[PDB]
Amino acid sequence: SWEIDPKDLTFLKELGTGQFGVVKYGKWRGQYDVAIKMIKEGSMSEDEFIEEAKVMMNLSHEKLVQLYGVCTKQRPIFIITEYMANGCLLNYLREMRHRFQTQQLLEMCKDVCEAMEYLESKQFLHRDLAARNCLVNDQGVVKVSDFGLSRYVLDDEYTSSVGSKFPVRWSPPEVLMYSKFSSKSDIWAFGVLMWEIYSLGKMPYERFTNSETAEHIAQGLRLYRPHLASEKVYTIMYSCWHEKADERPTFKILLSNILDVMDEN
C-alpha cells in the first residue's frame, strides 16, 4: 500500500463531510490536486481496512476515482484520492438539469459502465453504487467513487438492512432478504443509477419509505421510464432489475448495449 507522507499534503479547502467524517481538497507535493479523507475515530474498521487496502489501491482505471494512498502512522488516518472539481453526480445533475442533451446522459452511463466493467473484471464489488457515489471532473467526465468502502463502515443505521441509511432504493431482492452481494447486486444498482441520470437526479421511489420500497420491489414494482430515456435506453436499465440475479446482464454486456445505442444515434 502506498503510504503517503502527510508532510507532502497541503490542505486548501473544505469539501464537506461524508460517512467517515471530514474530507478536504489539497495538493500533494505542491502540484497534484487530491482529496483527503480524515477518518473520524470510530467511524471505520481501521485494522480491517489497512489489512485489505492494497487491493483497492491496485484498482486503476480512467473512470474510477483513484485511491492513491493512505497515511496510517498517525491518528486520524487519511485516505488520499483523486480530486473531482464538479463534485457528486447527483448534485451536478440537479444543478445543470436544464443544460443536458440526451447524448450527454448516455455518455454518463457509459463512463460509469466502463468503471464497473473494470471492477467486475477484477471480481471487486462496489457495494454502494448510486449517483451520490459518482463524481464529476472539470471536463464533465463521470467517475465511480468510494468503491468497496462500505465494508468498513461502523454505523448500524447504514449496515442494517432496516437502518435509515441503508441504500434500500439501490438494492436487489437478494441483498434486502439475504445480504447476498455480488456483481449482480452492483448490476441492479447500476440500473437505478441509469434511472437517476435520465431523470436528472430524482429520488428513486420518492414518497415510498424504505420498507415500502423493499416490499413493493420484491413484488415486482419497477421504476418507470423517465421522459428523457428512449425505449432502447429503458430496455437497458430495466434489464438490470430481473428478480433473479442470474438473469441479469454483466457489465460487459451492458457496455456493449450502451455502445450499440450510441452507434445507432
Ligand X SMILES: Cn1cc(-c2ccnc(-n3ncc4cc(C(C)(C)C)cc(F)c4c3=O)c2CO)cc(Nc2ccncn2)c1=O
Binding site per annotation, positions: 15-23, 37, 81-84, 149
What's the min distance (Å) between Cβ of 128 and ligand X?
4
Q: Which of 66, 72, 133, 185 binds ligand X (CB under 6 A)?
A: 133
Q: Which of 64, 67, 77, 84 binds ligand X (CB under 6 A)?
A: 84
DSSP for 189-243, written as a single string: HHHHHHHHHHTTSPPTTTTS-HHHHHHHHHTT--PPPPTT--HHHHHHHHHTT-S
Q: Which of 128, 166, 187, 188 binds ligand X (CB under 6 A)?
A: 128
Which residues lie closer than 8 Å to 146 by C-beta, 6 or more apart?
18, 65, 128, 133
Positions at the binding site for ATP: 15-23, 37
What's the min distance (Å) between Cβ of 159 and ligand X?
10
**Contact track, ligand X, 45-64, x by CB under 6 A:** --------------------
Of 128, 138, 155, 263, the active-site residue reads 128
**Contact track, ligand X, 88-127, x by CB under 6 A:** ----------------------------------------
From the number of C-beta atoms within 10 Å of its C-beta (0-12, 13-18, 19+), residue 86 rates as middle
Coil, helix or strand at residue 29: coil
Per-residue CA distances from 57 to 51, 60, 61, 84, 128 (Å): 12, 8, 11, 18, 18
State the chain's maximal CA–CA distance in angstroms: 55
Residue corresponding to grid cell 414518497: 207
128 catalytic? Reply is: yes
Q: Is residue 167 reached through a cis peptide bond, with omega within 30 degrees of 0 on the bond before it?
A: no
| Residue 251 to residue 162: CA distance in whole angstroms | 28
Q: Which of 59, 96, 141, 153 binds ligand X (CB under 6 A)?
A: 153
Which residues lie closer than 8 Å to 14 by C-beta, 6 or more apart?
22, 24, 25
- Work out whether 149 is an interface residue with ligand X (CB under 6 A): yes
From the number of C-beta atoms within 10 Å of its C-beta (0-12, 13-18, 19+), residue 114 rates as buried
What's the min distance (Å) between Cβ of 51 and ligand X?
17
Residue nearest to ligand X (CB): 18
Choice between 126 and 229, CB closer to ligand X: 126
Stretch that binds ligand X, among 13-21, 94-102, 175-183, 231-239 (CB under 6 A): 13-21
Q: How many residues bind ligand X (CB under 6 A)?
A: 23
What's the min distance (Å) between Cβ of 165 and ligand X?
8
Binding interface with ligand X (CB under 6 A): 15-20, 23, 35, 37, 65, 81, 83-85, 87, 128, 133, 135, 145-146, 149-150, 153
Enzyme catalytic residues: 128
